Amino acid sequence: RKPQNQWEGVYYYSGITKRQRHLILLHRKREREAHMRSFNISRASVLQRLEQLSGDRKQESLPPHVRLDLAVRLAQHGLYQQATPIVDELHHQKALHAGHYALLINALACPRLGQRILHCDAQCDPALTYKLLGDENGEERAQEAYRWFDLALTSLAVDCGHFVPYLPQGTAAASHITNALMRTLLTCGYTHVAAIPDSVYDRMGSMGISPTISTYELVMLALSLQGNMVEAESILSFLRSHHSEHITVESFNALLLGHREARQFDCCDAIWQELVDRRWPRASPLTAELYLRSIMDHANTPTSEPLQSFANINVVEKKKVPLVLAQMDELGVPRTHLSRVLMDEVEDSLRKFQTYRSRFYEWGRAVKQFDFIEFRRRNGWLYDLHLMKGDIYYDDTRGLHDRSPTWMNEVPETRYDRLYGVNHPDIAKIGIRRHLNVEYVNRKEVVERDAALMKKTLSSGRRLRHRVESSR
Amino acid sequence: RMGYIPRYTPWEWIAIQEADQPLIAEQIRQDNIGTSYFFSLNRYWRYKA
Amino acid sequence: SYTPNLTSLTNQVNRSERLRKWGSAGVPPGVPRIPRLEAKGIAILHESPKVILAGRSRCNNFDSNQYMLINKATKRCLLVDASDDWPDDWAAFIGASDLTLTHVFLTHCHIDNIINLNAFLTICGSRQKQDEIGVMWCPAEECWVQNFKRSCERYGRFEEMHQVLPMMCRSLYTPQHLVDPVRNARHLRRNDVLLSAATNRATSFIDFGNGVLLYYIFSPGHSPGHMMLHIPTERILFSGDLLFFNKVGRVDLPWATGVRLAESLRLLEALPDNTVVVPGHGRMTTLGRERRENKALQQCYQRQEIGKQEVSVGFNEGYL
Amino acid sequence: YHWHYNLPQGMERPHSVNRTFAAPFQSNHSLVNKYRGVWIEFDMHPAFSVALEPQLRKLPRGRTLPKTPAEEVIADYTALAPLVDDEKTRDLWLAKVFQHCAFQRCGGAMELWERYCHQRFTAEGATAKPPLSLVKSVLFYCNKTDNSGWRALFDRCLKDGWNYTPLFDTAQWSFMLKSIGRMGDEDGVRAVLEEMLDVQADLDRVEARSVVIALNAVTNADVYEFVKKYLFNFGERKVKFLRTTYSDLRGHGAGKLRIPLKENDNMYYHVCWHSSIRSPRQPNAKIDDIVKDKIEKWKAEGLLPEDY
Amino acid sequence: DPNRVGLNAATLDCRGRIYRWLRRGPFFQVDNYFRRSVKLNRDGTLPTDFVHEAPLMRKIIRLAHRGHLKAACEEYRRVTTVPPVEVYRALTACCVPGAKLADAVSIFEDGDSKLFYVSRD
Ligand SMILES: [Zn+2]
Ligand SMILES: [Zn+2]
DSSP, X not given: OOOOOSSSOOOOOOOOOHHHHHHXXXXXXXXXXXXXXXHHHHXXXXXXXXXXXXXTTSSSOOOHHHHHHHHHHHHHTTOOTTTHHXXXXXXXXXXXXXXXXXXXXXXXXXTTHHHHIIIXXXXXXXXXXXXXXXXXXXXXXXXXXXXXXXXXXXXXXXXXXXXXXXXXXXXXXXXHHHHHHHHHHHSSOHHHHTHIIIIIHHHHHHHTOOOOHHXXXXXXXXXXXXXXXXXXXXXXXXXXXXXXXXXXXXHHHHHHHHHHHTTOHHHHHHHHHHHHHHOOSOOOHHHHHHHHHHHHHHHSOOOSSSOSSSSOSGXXXXXXXXXXXXXXXXXXXXXXXXXXXXXXXXXXXXXXXXXXXXXXXXXXXXXXXXXXXXXHHHSOSSSOSSSOOOOGGXXXXXXXXXXXXXXXXXXXXXXXXXXXXXXXXXXXXXXXXXXXXXXXXXXXXXXXXXXXXXXHHXXXXXXXXXXXXXXX | OOSOOOSSOOHHHHHHHXXXXXXXXXXXXXXXXXXXXXXXXXXXXXXXX | OOOOOHHHHSOHHHHHHHHHHHTTSOSOOOOOOOOSTTOOOOEEEEEOSSEEEEEESOOSTTOBOEEEEEETTTOEEEEESOOOSOTTHHHHHHHTTTOEEEEEEOXXXXXXXXXXXXXXXXXXXXXXXXXXXXXXXXXXXXXXXXXXXXHHHHTTOOTTTSOOOGGGSOBTTSOOOOOOOOOHHHHOBOOEEEOOSOOOTXXXXXXXXXXXXXXXXXXXXXXXXXXXXXXXXXXXXXXXXXXXXXXXXXXXXXXXXXXXXXXXXXXXXXXXXXXXXXXXXXXXXXXXXXXXXXXXXXXXXXXXXHTOSSOOOOBSSSOO | OOOOSSSOOOOSOOOOOTTTSOXXXXXXXXXXXXXXXXXXXOOOOTTHHHHSHHHHTXXXXXXXXXXXXXXXXXXXXXXXXXXXXOHHHHHHHHHHHHHHHHHTTOGGGGHHIIIIIHHHHSSSSOOOOOOHHHHHHHHHHHHHTTOTTHHHHHGGGSTTTTOOGGGOOHHHHHHHHHHXXXXXXXXXXHHHHHHHHHTTOOGGGSOHHHHHHHTTTOOSHHHHHHHHHHGGGSOHHHHHHHHHHHHHHTTGGGGGSSSOOOOOHXXXXXXXXXXXXXXXXXXXXXXXXXXXXXXXXXXXXXXXXXXX | OOTTOOOOOOOOOSHHHHHHHSSOOSSSHHHHHHHHSOOOOSSSOOSOOOSTTHHHHXXXXXXXXXXXXXXXXXXXXXXXXXXXXXXXXXXHHHHTTTTOHHHHHHHXXXXXXXXXXXXXX
């Protein structure tokens, strides 16, 4: 029988229909419309709230907390220009305090516009949200964040009016506003996220403000977005040496994000395996999102030294996805807290690399194998990548023939059968009888039949020799 | 060379053979709750012990 | 069989006829080599004071036969249709009998005749090292030596595919190679005989030595060039594929004419009945037995008597 | 021919067949966990659900069908539904009794549509838009009891109307086509099948007993030629299964249907012709002047003589 | 329908049916007996409503409400049809006063994917 290929994989169904990929694209466009509809309804509500309190309260002065509540809601929805006359009169009336300034600068980073950018524009990539928030007035919001920081430190000197030459730089309010400044500057452009570890951090050191754990995590996230990993791991190495009790999850989230931008996928594996090992701080769904997206960027990355001679090699990195999802079940990370863009690619890796025991008993049936061949024969133009087009270290002088008796042990049956007539002058050296040298099962019976054929041929040849010359 | 047959399969050829065949989900064998002392041997008759 | 063109791949009956003949495999199993088991020895068929006929029956899985004429005086041997699955006994037989292999006679150039011809000239040519062996054949078989590689693909003889035939090499009847002046084992074969279709009883013979003449007879119909061997002094007729025991050759192969085969059966009616006809397949018979109890010869003359102008006789089930 | 044992037994070349060909899951058996029914999408606010909880108890919930007779839940909506002052609560409650009267086949539940919802949705160019759960429940009801009121509602779901046809499931079209073939509307079959092709519905996954009923009621000549070009839109696996189901529903398995089919043999012979086609093998003015010039010649030749 | 309950089998007549019997999977008798039996109905409801094993379902709920977990697990092994939602509600309520989480998950995992999502409640 013709042999079957043992290095050919079993035919199994790993893929989706053209209707299903269209229906995934159609359903994902509906919820992108739903988040676009949800933002503009609430944006129009805060703009109607602004014009109501400006028109009907034209001469009646509002209480300062209502104007403070509307100023943070304007800044959260990306409307920074409608909020700066509100904060300028609240600072002039001296109604703002230490916590109020940190509330306004944290609102200036717009955590309502970033929610629309995440679900609709950035395709649920948490690294791309910082890259896309910098375009909607990134330099303009950074100047007002620097201006409100100068408004804050001027107010803190009034609010602190012993430790008198070391106020307000030694208080908790100075670092809280400085942590609010670095959080707002991360949402700005590339010129301002580069100024966080260099310009803002040295200004905090020159002012003598003691940092906190949220200070270092935003600096590590700022160095993560630049792509500088030799400095980002050094800050956590300072935190691993000195302040190890206060390390939260966001330092690990910066390093998982940072090696994803630098495309060092071997490093981001070791950070995830470290977080599974220590199990403290707890793995957020942002940890599972940043690590699984680094797998998919590594899986869709083409290689160029074999130049894809047979297939894509990096697609084997999606086999780790059932291992990571099994680790999320024990870490307490719910897999339903994953984004819709990532969950389609996670289930893409699951139907390609996962099988159950009930399916493994039925996946090799000849009916399913021959359906795979006919479906490749009928429509292979729709789903194909090709159709689109002693001890040796102390040995040096070896001791040979150490009188080890091979006659105490018994291996007596090593008889070998060679072909008849090797040195015979009548038998030729080359011939088709040379193929008898490669035969193992019938080695004894073939060469004794071959010797009996060659002995009778040389006997009949030499008896024909003696008959012809004796007759003439 | 004229007859070079490698005695080690290359890293590209190993990665192709691993990427073509799927994994079995019961090979992870993780367990954190414990053994069902009352129900696991008395489950439904098709998938029973 | 033939070249798989576009209409042969898009035909359903090509996929259906390959299911009927060979079952679920669809590929025809070839004609393999006979192993060193189930193989017999070389027999001495005839001994005469002039020549000696030594033969071997069923030397291929085509059930072909291998014969050799041994001249007693000149010590010169001659192979007829050199196709043996083991041409190593034949080299040892001529080496132990002090014989000189000078020529190889070929009746026709089917795969039952020239499958091991390069093996015959290499093994027997190596023994004379411690004048080369000639090939006697008819140039009408040029169409069958071009399709020798096609016949080896269908019958599974892959080891003899990539072998240039020695009769295809440059002989004395061909223009010579103009090699660079800065090797004639394969460039020139001086010992080569091309037989002519104008075969008569006067001059169309081979002088085998000591006064025996091998009259070659052109008798097509099974093949374009089919040269029998007739020894009138010894009553021996090597018919090849023309006449067997109670049957004749096939016509259902290319370049095989049924009306040419009937004319080939009529040109042996002047030979006596005790002429022992020695076919290429099966058992040997006499020409008088085939004139009495062969239905192919009986149908050939019955159609001739009732007035058929183009008498067409021939087999469709038998030997190649 | 083989591989010898003293040779190195390495892999000759790797084979990536499962990554070059990504095959979707195709089984001849149907899915054992599918709902095989019309979903209502009950999305009530969680304050009226616990308030109307003794009234919603006798109503069909998710994968649960209570056997309360339909005349009691009609009387519950007759009295208690004017008490609740919420528009979408009464519409979602009315969708459940329309679903409850469909499963028990109560033909008198169409009075509830004319009582409450006809005047504000389907009367005299109403600009109000009904919810999707209400349109799905009344179209499933009118198809179950073979009511003729589906035509005014199906015309409202077009692209200029309510535009609810991209929100219909594949099981909604299966119950739709079964009722039109039972009542025998030739233009009702064509207007739905043109809508299903315009909406890009799953044509290969409609119920096969539903298609062969809607195709059996095709008797008009112009819509019969529409079926001939529409039959190529199905798959080759689907069109060979439409032949086997239509041959059994008119043959031995005629008792599976509630009412028997009518004998339409010109649709039967065309489906048997179309299934065999998809399966593998196993100038009048110028011509009339030619003939009149010949008869003119034959009278001159004498071949066509006069009276003797 | 109580009188139409029962499944008839074949006789393995021809040689081609013997070769299919020798080429069947590991679960061919128990799988085809499970699919010829109870399945999801035309209206979409469960096959829970079975007449012949109805008081057996009353026995398990009677055993799981009194705290007899092991006896309720023993009578659950005797079922052939799809059990109702009320037995899974009673079995998981029997595991809570003893904090038996491993038994309660295996009760849910039996009816989650294998028995048409009757325990997903
Ligand atoms: Zn021949
Ligand atoms: Zn022959």
